[PDB]
Amino acid sequence: YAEQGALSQTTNESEKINQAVAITEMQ
Amino acid sequence: LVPSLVPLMLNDMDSPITNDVLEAIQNANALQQQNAEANAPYNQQIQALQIQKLQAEIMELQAKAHKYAEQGALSQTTNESEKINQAVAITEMQ
């Protein structure tokens, strides 16, 4: 369960990086 | 207080059976403490094992709370990305 939570944290971080580059791909 | 007084009571008896009763008490106490010190490793093993079980429950519930909190944060982030997709789809429409 702890490693599943860490995996969820890492894919949350990758979705955040995808948003942080999609805001610059928009503008 | 009563069962701790009966050897001190029986030491003060003028009966001829007293020397038999006292060694019977000594043999019973020796057998009782022998059984107690023979069964005590199993008791401390059960104690340590129950302590480890109750600690395993701590780490289990903490790991469940951690994974549920990170799943909620993941849901928040994908909600934000769907919101950004809508906020650019309204301008792709117009």
Curated annotation (Swiss-Prot), chain B:
It is found in: Virion. Residues 17-73 form a coiled coil. Forms the portal vertex of the capsid. This portal plays critical roles in head assembly, genome packaging, neck/tail attachment, and genome ejection. The portal protein multimerizes as a single ring-shaped homododecamer arranged around a central channel. Homododecamer. This is Portal protein. It comes from Helicobacter pylori bacteriophage KHP30. The chain holds residues 470 to 563 of 602 of the full protein.
